[PDB]
Amino acid sequence: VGLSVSRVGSAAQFPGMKQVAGTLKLELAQYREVAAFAQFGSDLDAATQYVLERGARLTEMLKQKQFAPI
Amino acid sequence: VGLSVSRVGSAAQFPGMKQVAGTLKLELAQYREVAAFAQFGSDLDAATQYVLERGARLTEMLKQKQFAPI
Amino acid sequence: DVFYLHSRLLERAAKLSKELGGGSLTAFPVIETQAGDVSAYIATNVISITDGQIFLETELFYKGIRPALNVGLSVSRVGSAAQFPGMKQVAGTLKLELAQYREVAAFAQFGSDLDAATQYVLERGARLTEMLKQKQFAPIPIERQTVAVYAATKGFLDKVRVQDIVAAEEAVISQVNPAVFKILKANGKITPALDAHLKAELRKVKLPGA
Amino acid sequence: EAAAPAGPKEFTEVWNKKAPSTLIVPEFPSNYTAVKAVGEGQVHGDAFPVNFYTPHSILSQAQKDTVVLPGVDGYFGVKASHVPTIAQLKPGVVELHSGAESEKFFVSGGFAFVHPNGVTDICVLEAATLDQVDPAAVKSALAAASAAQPTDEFEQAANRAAIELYSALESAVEAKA
Amino acid sequence: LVPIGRGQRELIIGDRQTGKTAVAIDAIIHQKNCNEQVPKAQRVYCVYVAVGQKRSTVAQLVKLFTQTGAMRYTIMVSATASDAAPLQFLAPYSGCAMAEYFRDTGKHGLIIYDDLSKQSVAYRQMSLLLRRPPGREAFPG
Amino acid sequence: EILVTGIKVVDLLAPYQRGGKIGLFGGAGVGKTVLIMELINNVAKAHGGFSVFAGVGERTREGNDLYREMIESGVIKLGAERGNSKCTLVYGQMNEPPGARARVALTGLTVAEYFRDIEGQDVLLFVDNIFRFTQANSEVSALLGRIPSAVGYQPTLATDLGGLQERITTTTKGSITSVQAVYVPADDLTDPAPATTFAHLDATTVLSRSIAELGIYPAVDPLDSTSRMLNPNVIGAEHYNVARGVQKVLQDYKNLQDIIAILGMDELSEEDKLTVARARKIQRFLSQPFQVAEVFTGTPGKYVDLADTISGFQGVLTGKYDDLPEMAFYMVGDIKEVKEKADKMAKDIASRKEADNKKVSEELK
Amino acid sequence: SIAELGIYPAVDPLDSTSRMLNPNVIGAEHYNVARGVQKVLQDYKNLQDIIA
Amino acid sequence: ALTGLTVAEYFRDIEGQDVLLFVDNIFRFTQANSEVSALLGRIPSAVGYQPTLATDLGGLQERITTTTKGSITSVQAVYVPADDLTDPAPATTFAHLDATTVLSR
Amino acid sequence: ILGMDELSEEDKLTVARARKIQRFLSQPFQVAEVFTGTPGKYVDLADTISGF
Amino acid sequence: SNQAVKQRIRAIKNIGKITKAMKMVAASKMKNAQIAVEQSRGLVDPFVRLFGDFPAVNSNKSVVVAVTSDKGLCGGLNSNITKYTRATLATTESEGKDVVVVSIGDKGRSQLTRIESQRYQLAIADTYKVRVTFGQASLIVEELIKHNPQSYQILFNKFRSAISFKPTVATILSPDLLEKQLEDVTGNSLDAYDIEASHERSDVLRDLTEFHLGVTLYNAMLENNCSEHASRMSAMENSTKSAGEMLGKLTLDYNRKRQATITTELIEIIAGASALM
């Protein structure tokens, strides 16, 4: 998600998706900034735990099996 | 010792050396996978301490002089 | 033959003998490096041709230290004997003090600890660093440089704050009477008759602030 | 006899003789305490500064005028300039007084000093005020304590401490006015 | 740890001055020590090929092999650095042909191609001056 | 046979053969001209034969400086007493075309080979920048119509270098002690022209840029310089064991160079902090002032005997000098001067409070 | 690096690939246990940094 | 780029104006000149650029100057290949740059 | 890592000045007013130096 | 060749990510374990108000404890108090007396059993795994009054701030051995206090000195835990700085090797094509 670009961008996507994926890419970027804290045992200040659980569920929501498009 | 390979292995060495050098080949490998944790020295359960305290003896055993074959 | 290209050029800068007129030619070749890599091909070719180097560090140039002379790497082993005496009397101690200033360089208290007995070498190497900063298109005569490094080295500027040593230097050059400059330029060395009058004229200067 | 003047400033010179000059002199806990015992003051009238301490919480550092402490010879009130004392406290209720307002903490033991500069210091290990303790488990705990009495010395000392603390806690929960 | 066999090719590889010639030399000395102890058919005839080495090193090795007695079973093929590039190119093949006599007549041979990376360099020079097209690090294909 | 040079790192870790070929590998500014001048200063004065200096592709100012120093020191005499001069200079410096720099080493070899073969003498031959022979052959080789070899050199690098270097030989009728400076082109030891030179030499003295940037002079890499004389049967077991112990401590410090950088020394073991302390002592103790470097450094040069080097490094290896600081070992002659510098380093911190210097009523004297 | 651990055959458990690793071909038990083995091995390979 | 610079040069020399000239991705100018040099059978320089690299850039960048009649000011978008500022194309472009405007996300 | 609580006021006047400085670098453009509503501003050099 | 430098870059990059995570971990641990350090500072006040502070006492036996850490990324704490331990111990042992050295934390048993080995009787560890409690410190003090010395030296780092950690020695005189003797000022200074205990003063002083040892030992290991977290917060900042500096140099080295790689491969291709064309 960090290295994939689209220069046309949000101007050529679903407007139902445009209002909901905009929060998603910011939450995933915040999850990428904090992704070193994920394999730590001593739990952090609960603002980074919130993004570390939220982004770790959002990356599970982007999974998809083969040859079954949605 | 982790990179020097031979294709024959057995059936090309001394049968007395074949009984003895297997416990050398294994315990030098035990020494090498421990010695990459030699910055801390926690000496886990006197087992990671013991295997380096035997592997250092094995590497010091394997040294010899020049122009004096055994 | 890219080494031959520069060796042909730079071997023509010489000091001729007395039966050839005695003239001289001094070369200042300029080599630009990429990211401070001085182990490059053309860089190390011209280093192994020329007599010395003036390494201009890119880190000191953006920290305001201009000219950004890398004092640890830049040598000159041919004009070391061809130095103005007086500047040879003070600048050897200057280079020694800047050498032992780089034993606490950027780990004063940044890494682990501070000694506060070697606070003096830090708060003196900062003065010797700010002494050598110099604005552009304004070269100084050598007799006004050896007096400034005399004031910076003998201890006449330690109570000046580090923010105003560049003003203290021009105040020293302005307030000390110009006879000592002519005596040091003509005699070519700080004589024992001159350092007493110089320490006299250096204790009646109005160093600003402090 | 006072022929050996030990102390922090006397430690510094012997440390400058036998320990090297590479290290600065170590600190001492008397360098962090602004209030001492014999250095006069702190009363300035009818109030006097109290210091109610547990190891885990500072309960009060305000200035009271009456302190009721449960000493081992019985309860006693500490007014403004009390006599200097070192009172071993039994389980009981410490009562602080600011005037019309009062704080009533039930403590578990500990000590209480009154110092010659009029300050006082209450040093307990667990001081739970009376709404935090339930009256239902104190009788269950005393019934589980005062019935099974081992004749072994350590267990009977623990049992004596148990029946003393739980009896004081039972007499303290209903004695609120 | 790395047990050799009697017909096995074993590469001694390392940086400069890491003891490769020492291992090959001690192997030759041990064949001298074993050849005076075995019955005439497990005896090992060493052949040392010195490719690209200087002549002082080869003379020191001949002095070593004579002062220990290993020269009675050892042949030394010496194409030094002063020799032509085809001589250093051809000296491992000369040493292998000299060592194949013992292999083909029922005896057991030991061949050391010291500095095979110098025989490759001599072959590179020899083929580049024949105007054959160069490849990886200007070596032949 | 050993040849003692008075240099601590040279006499300890890679001693020079008396009739052998010596290489001084260097990277443009690391000091292989200062080192070869110190070897001229130390070896050629104690030598009984003739010296032949071959200047191949170096500075002409350096050739003039060497000529004036050899006239002044008396090893070159002018006029009628010229027969008592003990040095021949053969100069093909970097102002010459590549045809002259390609054959001036052969002229130096011819002058040395006449003294070796016909005169039967023991010769010294100092060749400054034997790389310039290879570079001149690579310069002329592009115009001879050859296909280039690896990184841009001639295809005949190894055979030209071999045909040059095999003429320098201690024979049965005479000896040549050859000290050749070799230049690595961009601090690359894997460059083919020094990598080919490495196989021709009995004792390499690889000077490093990083050791010079630490201020250590001579900037000899202790874990990259080798010699055939470092063998217990030729230099004795004591000297050999001391050199191998010093190399072991330096290699154990070089193994810890990444943990110390990214974590600091406070996370090292107690046995490894002692290794780092002894290694930082022995790598200051390898440095040494030179008699030819005293003109631009100010400190007088130090000639160090071999037994003083072994006796000093025995004491630093066993732990006899854990008391003295690390800078007491820096740029001193022997193990006596370490103790006589740790005295001056602790008189001086007690000389913060000695007096207040003032000279009064002086202006009319 | 797998053979340097003494493990033989030194197959990279992640970098090895097949067209048969497909739940529609080998079955959703075999496919899921192979994906679980690769998941736990990739998790351990990510933990091998912070372990040292 | 020479076409656009000529259209700017008419506004500089004849109109006497202070014209702007925008070169979008001067690295693509360098890359196109490198491809032209490679198609003409010329031996490439360092990392893959043309041997004429400094002079093909300088033939463009030296015509962007202020004269006595007018000026051409140039704002060139600069791409840095593999984020290497020591790559020959950005290192040769930076010898002509009088300013730098970094736009960041 | 710590917060605004442990910042000194000597290191909070710098924050309170640098925030409005990095706000004051922003400026509406004339070519964007056809879709952003707010008009564009041309700032002189002397006005920039005085206002900073 | 060119892949080893890229894998070393990939090593130092997530080493820097590790140490940047560890700095904020230690910073949150310093922020959470600061209020307990501030609370436990109160109870050490009345005992040095009452019993004073007499470090340089002439004793017959002294248990010296050096409160070290458990995990060792603190960066110059557990060795600095080992230096301070020997510096305060050589000061106070010139009477021919016995000295027992104890360490709390197992990074002190690795640093104290080689400098003073035969006087090392006790090693305590794992005191910071769950938390530091007063029952834990009271049990540790009970094993300290197993033997009966005349003094108890506590070596620990006082958490002055997140930047400064002053190492502090604290002394507890055992009652009848030294405390009743070190208070005599024309009579005594303790006789101004009216003892309101059950038994005599010789026993209420015993209870007071054991409780004072427990109080200052609890406060000592709590202060040392907070200094451990605040020194790890700085050591991991130094490790991020060093592993960003090393990464910045290694990136330039990789770029030089990459440029030289494309140049040498292209020169090989041109040299091959010029022999044929």
Ligand SMILES: Nc1ncnc2c1ncn2[C@@H]1O[C@H](COP(=O)(O)OP(=O)(O)OP(=O)(O)O)[C@@H](O)[C@H]1O
């Ligand atoms: N087993 C050993 N014990 C002690 N020293 C040794 C041993 N093996 C080799 N050496 C030393 O290592 C040095 C290099 O030895 P050797 O010539 O075998 O390496 P090399 O790789 O062949 O060198 P080169 O690359 O220059 O040919 C020699 O000086 C030798 O004394």
Ligand SMILES: Nc1ncnc2c1ncn2[C@@H]1O[C@H](COP(=O)(O)OP(=O)(O)O)[C@@H](O)[C@H]1O
């Ligand atoms: N032994 C030494 N003592 C002091 N400085 C040295 C020493 N060796 C080298 N240097 C410094 O390093 C530089 C090396 O120059 P040079 O001897 O010409 O080496 P190279 O021929 O490799 O360039 C000199 O300018 C000198 O200042």
Ligand SMILES: [Mg+2]
């Ligand atoms: Mg060899």
Ligand SMILES: [Mg+2]
């Ligand atoms: Mg030179």
